[PDB]
Design a protein around this ligand. Structure first.
Ligand code: LW8
Length: 265
């Protein structure tokens, strides 16, 4: 059977269940390998070697982490696809239609207190903030290392935690500034102030299905099926599905089932 992997986020579970249910509807055998610790850093090699068959990746993450390209070049999907096929024998099916990129968030009270609107504002007052993020945020060149080269933050403290504990650390006041994702249900849930990336540091993170070319060779129907999801999930749809899971307490499975029904797939 085809093994569908995801990163350990609610959004990735929704996408994984959408892929798994869609393939199961076409009688393709599926095994779920959800919430792989470390995300891409462990998904990418397992995909290359064949432990996994497909997952949903973001363009800018492949651009920096796997393709070894500099952030001085604009992320280019056609380049990503060509190099993935030539060097990795991997196929980007397409783009789902939405872009979940990095941002920075603080409490709205702190934003008003310190006149913080932009990333540079946060850096300017950073000695008054305890910043927290997931482990990989301090390792990827497109995350904290680049933010430090571009903005030179001097946070009072740094806290590394499991990716699913960040907002909880913010709620407990262990940290009072953190990295967020633009489609996170918790941005609205906690009424956070998301800062403006005034130097345009973070690239494009459009979500798309990455699948082994061997799997498409064995199952052309899987490619034909998965292309029906192309451009069917814009930013608002991803944000609402995540809201349905994290706020309305629906399971990722039920959210994916309802979405596929809505699409008529
Ligand atoms: C989707 N995203 C915002 C572009 C990040 C999120 C993420 C990074 N690492 C893990 S784990 N999750 C990514 O996958 O690079």
């Amino acid at each position: 059977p085809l093994v569908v992997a995801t990163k350990p986020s609610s959004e990735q579970y929704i996408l994984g269940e959408i892929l798994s249910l869609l393939l199961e509807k076409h009688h393709i055998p599926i095994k779920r390998a959800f919430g792989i610790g470390g995300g891409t850093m462990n998904i990418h090699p397992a995909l290359i070697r064949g432990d996994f068959d497909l997952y949903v990746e973001y363009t800018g993450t492949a651009w920096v982490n796997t393709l070894k390209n500099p952030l001085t070049q604009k992320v280019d999907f056609e380049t990503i696809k060509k190099r993935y096929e030539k060097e990795f024998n991997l196929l980007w099916v397409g783009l789902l239609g939405f872009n979940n990129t990095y941002s920075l968030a603080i409490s709205k009270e702190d934003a008003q207190k310190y006149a913080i609107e932009t990333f540079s504002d946060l850096a300017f007052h950073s000695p008054n903030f305890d910043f927290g993020a997931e482990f990989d945020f301090f390792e990827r060149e497109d995350a904290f290392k680049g933010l430090m080269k571009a903005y030179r933050f001097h946070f009072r403290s740094l806290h590394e935690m499991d990716i699913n504990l960040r907002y909880k650390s913010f709620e407990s006041h262990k940290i009072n500034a953190l990295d967020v994702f633009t489609t996170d249900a918790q941005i609205k849930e906690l009424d956070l102030k998301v800062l403006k990336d005034d130097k345009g540091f973070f690239p494009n993170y459009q979500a798309g299905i990455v699948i082994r070319k061997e799997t498409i060779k064995k199952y052309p129907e899987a490619l034909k099926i998965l292309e029906k999801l192309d451009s069917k999930i814009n930013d608002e749809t991803m944000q609402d599905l995540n809201y349905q899971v994290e706020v309305l307490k629906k399971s990722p499975k039920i959210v994916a089932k309802d979405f596929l029904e809505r699409l008529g797939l």
